[PDB]
Design a protein around this nucleic acid. Structure first.
Lengths: 674, 141, 196
RNA sequence: GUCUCCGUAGUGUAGGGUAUCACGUUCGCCUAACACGCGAAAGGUCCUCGGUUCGAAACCGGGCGGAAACA
RNA sequence: UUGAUAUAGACAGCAGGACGGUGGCCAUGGAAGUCGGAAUCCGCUAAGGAGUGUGUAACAACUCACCUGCCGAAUCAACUAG
């Protein structure tokens, strides 16, 4: 009784602190052993029981039946005691004569089961025989011949079947759909309670607007198709009835994510067995066939033409753990993509995304979750041999400070020469770029005004913007300071193309840079237009730009990204420690309005994320909800120019995977003499 | 409790910072200030001093009084931009002066020695004056 | 430095004993440095406090006070832990303001508590996260208005007993004053005289 | 293991009194243009290190190597 | 053997106190005495190092040398070779 009471008080407390739905919209949620909403049994031995059954045969051995068992059901649980000497209960902890008694609970509930158990584990034969007739349970076949612990199981299973006990308990305590909708739809339908679908869902009138929501999608027997699982909330569904098919990104005023079709058949699911049914009215679960191709992950089904979407499900977990999936054989990529689509269609939380270099990334909750995903993928979703690897961390490059010298390049016919300079960015102007407050589409005068007023930007160069980096929108700016010179206007297209090639196709690891400025100082251009071709300038532009970026003490930066981790009070030290070992720090920690929950946000480098959730669970005892989103980039501390620095290891492995010359070239190939 | 008690201290200064500031991390001690509270705190706290600038915050329901301790460590860096003799004498006078005193000369040694890393009067280390504390050892009283 | 140190202590106490004609004996108990610092500050203008090992004064008075006799009775009067505060003004004023300067000596681990402090029944105001301490110590407390509330006063510790670690930290979080002690005062000396 | 020989333009090559040539790249002539051809330019601290003498890639000592030959 | 401490009371145990600038500078993703590059103070005292170690992401927390209480006579260290 002691352990039972602590367990049930603890569940009461932990439903009080979170489930603010106390008296009011649902009244008393409280879990309480008195009124039979708490059941006792051990599933290994097929038995379960509540106080109610013992109340019943106690009444029997002593309309109005319900109350006459309910009075002593209230009496039995609690601190109230019972005496055997007088065969009467007692609110006192001891007899009037002064002798203590065990409580009514133990004396009338756990004395009998223990008497049953000890006698059969110590093999007490005639005691068992007199108990069975004292327990007046039928003696069926096969139990009078065997013995031992299996006899224990069989006989007390026959005494208290779990089937009837839990069937009756759940029928009397859990609520049927009429009661469920009156307080469930406010978090189910985005539509106002005045719309026609709203009244249907509140009432569950199975003769009007068919409401549906497909959440689980279980695979079929064949291999590639599935059944769409969901519980009907309104209306009555039948075979082949034309119905709107809308998913999450659907908007009522648009046809996107909208489909108009019937269903193929209506199938009930039971265990491993299936059964078609003619029709299903409101309130209950069912599986459907033929809804496979026209839904993604999850969606809803509505007969009504104005019904909006249902509320998309929220997960405490996020697709945080990621692993790359590429086939063993290069000619399985379409097979693989059909596999990934099937996998993403099956489990309603995974995300399959193509990252910038093209890898196929499967993002999920935990390592075991992902493990099951790729197991099913390599078995049935694609049935194709697979190769596994962590996601590759992509890196952007930058310069620490200004290039020391004015870099010079010569055309391969030596008819032209280039003078230019390089700078880093004083602040996160690249962040304003990605935000969009500075962009190519922005006009020259107004963008110039913004730059001059906000970042002390040169007014002379205010009208001298040339390029905005990769694709003309990237976080790299090229301008010109060359004064009064003439054929440079015919070099601009070539220099812009060269700078584009340089930024997209980089220098140290052949990657994109971020937050770097380039200004061309002086140019000596051959008079005629034929000797300074694009194949004669653009290579020189890239040479000179690589020269500059090497001369300026080059640097590397890592995608340090935000981890929003949900955690209770007791193991904030755990997240502190794990972020510390993984080069991470919290910048935002706060308490939530409930009580036990801490919402905590910390910076963490992406390359440190592999296995991060695993050790997080290890140090938290499985008490962490590590949401992960990208935050920003930041300078990687070490200087790649030294070999013994961690950037040097990054650049080496990145060059290795990109299959290039491991050695960084010296300034000889980029910088040339006059 | 004087209608509010958020008297705990803060250790940011110089630039406003704001976003770089720890206001999100020290929100729930008073729960009132938030970013507007941080900004109004630093508007009066931008200057005086120019350092970590430890401050003691006394709430005003919505606003706060960020009284700065006259920390010798803070003020010396606030004064250097060098002899600063009468200035450091005056700075010693403006603090609570207690510093486990026996005499004014005790705090004089303490605050003319506190900047053993910030140098001292012109071309001498902040120790010779401490040994020969005679020039105005009674100048404060 | 030790030899010159002892020489200096002899000399300073000798000079200050020649200077102050009347003194008063204090027992420096298990007292913090903060409280001694603060009283020595409060006493700084009017009196002087000092102490060390309880025997340099013994040798000093027994070997250097023959020329100033009637300074022999302290010899059996200073034993154990002791403190000397030498003052010039009236005795009664010093007595009253010293017994007035009180400090809330906390409930440190492993200390005797000759006082009976029992927790009453009131709303502590604490957040709903520290109830584990009370539930371990045997107090049933339910959250009220978002605050920890103790339903009934229950006895905590008697006199002259040993205090528990979780109990000690309980007293610490509640901030209610445990056994408090500053300067414990035994004997007074006034030019050849003994009193309370 | 010992012994013998040898470490040079990108590549390979010969060689005390400032590294030759071939190809490699650029290159400029010729051609309608390519090819071809020719020309120049660039290009190796001569394996490293210690010594020796006015000075050493050379001469003498080591260390590495590589190659055989014996064992 | 060499040195050191010790009635001005060691050694050892048990009990106390071990503070302000200062969460010293510069490093910072976080470094408060303790990840580190430098400087190395003073007030108070009996005493406290801008720090012995443990520890915290840091705090916090202890711990130490520093001094004091009981304790009242010798003790302790580095070597040496039988």
């Amino acid at each position: 009784y002691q352990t039972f009471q602590r367990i049930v008080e603890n569940v009461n407390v932990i439903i009080s602190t979170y489930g603010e739905g106390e008296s009011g919209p649902m009244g008393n949620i409280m879990i309480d052993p008195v009124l039979g909403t708490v059941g006792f049994g051990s599933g290994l031995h097929g038995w379960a029981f509540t106080l109610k059954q013992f109340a019943e045969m106690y009444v029997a051995k002593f309309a109005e039946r319900a109350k006459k068992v309910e009075d002593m059901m209230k009496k039995l649980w609690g601190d109230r005691y019972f005496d055997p000497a007088n065969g009467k209960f007692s609110k006192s902890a001891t007899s009037p004569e002064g002798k203590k008694l065990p409580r009514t609970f133990c004396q009338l509930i756990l004395d009998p089961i223990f008497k049953v158990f000890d006698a059969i584990m110590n093999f007490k034969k005639e005691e068992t025989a007199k108990l069975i007739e004292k327990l007046d349970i039928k003696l069926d076949s096969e139990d009078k011949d065997k013995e031992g612990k299996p006899l224990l199981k069989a006989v007390m299973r026959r005494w208290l079947p779990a089937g009837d006990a839990l069937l009756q308990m759940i029928t009397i305590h859990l609520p049927s759909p009429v009661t469920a909708q009156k307080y469930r739809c406010e978090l189910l339908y985005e539509g106002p309670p005045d719309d026609e679908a709203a009244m249907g869902i509140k009432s569950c009138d199975p003769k009007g607007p068919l409401m549906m929501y497909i959440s689980k999608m279980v695979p079929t027997s064949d291999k590639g198709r599935f059944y769409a699982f969901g519980r009907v909330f309104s209306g009555l569904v039948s075979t082949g009835l034309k119905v709107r098919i809308m998913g999450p990104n659907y908007t009522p005023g648009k046809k996107e994510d909208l489909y108009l079709k019937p269903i193929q058949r209506t199938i009930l699911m039971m265990g491993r067995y299936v059964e078609p049914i003619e029709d299903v009215p409101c309130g209950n679960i069912v599986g459907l066939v033929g809804v496979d191709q026209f839904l993604v992950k999850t969606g809803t089904i509505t007969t009504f033409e104005h019904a909006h979407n249902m509320r998309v499900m929220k997960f405490s977990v996020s697709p945080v753990v990621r692993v790359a999936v590429e086939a063993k054989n290069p000619a399985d990529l379409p097979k693989l993509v059909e596999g990934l689509k099937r996998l993403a269609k099956s489990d309603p939380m995974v995300q399959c995304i193509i990252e910038e270099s093209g890898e196929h990334i499967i993002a999920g909750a935990g390592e075991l979750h992902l493990e099951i995903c790729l197991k099913d993928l390599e078995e049935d979703h694609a049935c194709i041999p697979i190769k596994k690897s962590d996601p590759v961390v992509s890196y952007r490059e930058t310069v620490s400070e200004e290039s020391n010298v004015l870099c010079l390049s010569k055309s391969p016919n030596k008819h032209n020469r280039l003078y230019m300079k390089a700078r880093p960015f004083p602040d996160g102007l690249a962040e304003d770029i990605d935000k969009g407050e500075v962009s190519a589409r922005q006009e020259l005068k107004q963008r110039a005004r913004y730059l001059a007023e906000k970042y002390e930007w040169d007014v002379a160069e205010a009208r001298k913007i040339w390029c905005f980096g990769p694709d003309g929108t990237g976080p790299n700016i090229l301008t010109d300071i060359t004064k009064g010179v003439q054929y440079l206007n015919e070099i601009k297209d070539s220099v812009v193309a060269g700078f584009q090639w340089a930024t997209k196709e980089g220098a140290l690891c052949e990657e994109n840079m971020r937050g770097v400025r380039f200004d061309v100082h002086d140019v000596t251009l051959h008079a005629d237009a034929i000797h300074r071709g694009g194949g004669q300038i653009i290579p020189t532009a890239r040479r000179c730009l690589y020269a500059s970026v090497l001369t300026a003490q080059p640097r590397l930066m890592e995608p340090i990204y935000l981890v929003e981790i949900q955690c209770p009070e007791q193991v904030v030290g755990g997240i502190y420690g794990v972020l510390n070992r993984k080069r991470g720090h919290v910048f935002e920690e706060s308490q939530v309005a409930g009580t036990p929950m801490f919402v905590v946000k910390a910076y963490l480098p992406v390359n440190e994320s592999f296995g991060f959730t695993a050790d997080l669970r290890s140090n938290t005892g499985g008490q962490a909800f590590p949401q992960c989103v990208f935050d920003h980039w930041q300078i990687l501390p070490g200087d790649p120019f030294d070999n013994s620095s961690r950037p040097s290891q990054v650049v080496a492995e990145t060059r290795k995977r990109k299959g290039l010359k491991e050695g960084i070239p010296a300034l000889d190939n980029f910088l040339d003499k006059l | 409790p004087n209608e509010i008690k958020v008297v705990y201290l803060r250790c940011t200064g110089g630039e406003v910072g704001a976003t770089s500031a720890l206001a999100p991390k020290i929100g729930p001690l008073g729960l009132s200030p938030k970013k507007v509270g941080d900004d109004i705190a630093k508007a009066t706290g931008d200057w005086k001093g120019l350092r970590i600038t430890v401050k003691l915050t006394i709430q005003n329901r919505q606003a706060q009084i960020e009284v700065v301790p006259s920390a010798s460590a803070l003020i010396i860096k606030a004064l250097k931009e060098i002899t600063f003799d009468e200035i450091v004498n005056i700075a010693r006078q403006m603090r609570h002066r207690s510093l486990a005193r026996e005499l004014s000369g005790t705090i004089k040694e303490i605050l003319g020695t506190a900047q053993s890393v910030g140098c001292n009067v012109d071309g001498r280390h902040p120790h010779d004056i401490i040994d020969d504390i005679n020039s105005g050892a009674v100048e404060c009283p | 430095d030790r030899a010159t140190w002892k020489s200096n202590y002899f000399l300073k106490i000798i000079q200050l004993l020649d200077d102050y004609p009347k003194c008063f004996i204090v027992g420096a108990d298990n007292v913090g440095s903060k409280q001694m610092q603060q009283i020595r500050m409060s006493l700084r203008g009017k009196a002087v406090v000092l102490m060390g090992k309880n025997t340099m004064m013994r040798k000093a008075i027994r070997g250097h006070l023959e020329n100033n006799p009637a300074l022999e009775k302290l010899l059996p009067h200073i034993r154990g832990n002791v403190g000397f505060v030498f003052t010039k003004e009236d005795l009664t004023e010093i007595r009253d303001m010293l017994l007035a300067n009180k400090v809330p000596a906390a409930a440190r681990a492993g200390a005797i508590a000759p006082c009976e402090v029992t927790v009453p029944a009131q709303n502590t105001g604490l957040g709903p996260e520290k109830t584990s301490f009370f539930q371990a110590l045997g107090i049933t407390t339910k959250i009220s208005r978002g605050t920890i509330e103790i339903l009934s006063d229950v006895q905590l510790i008697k006199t002259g007993d040993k205090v528990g670690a979780s109990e000690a930290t309980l007293l610490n979080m509640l901030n209610i004053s445990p056994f408090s002690f500053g300067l414990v005062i035994q004997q007074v000396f006034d030019n050849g005289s003994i009193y309370n």
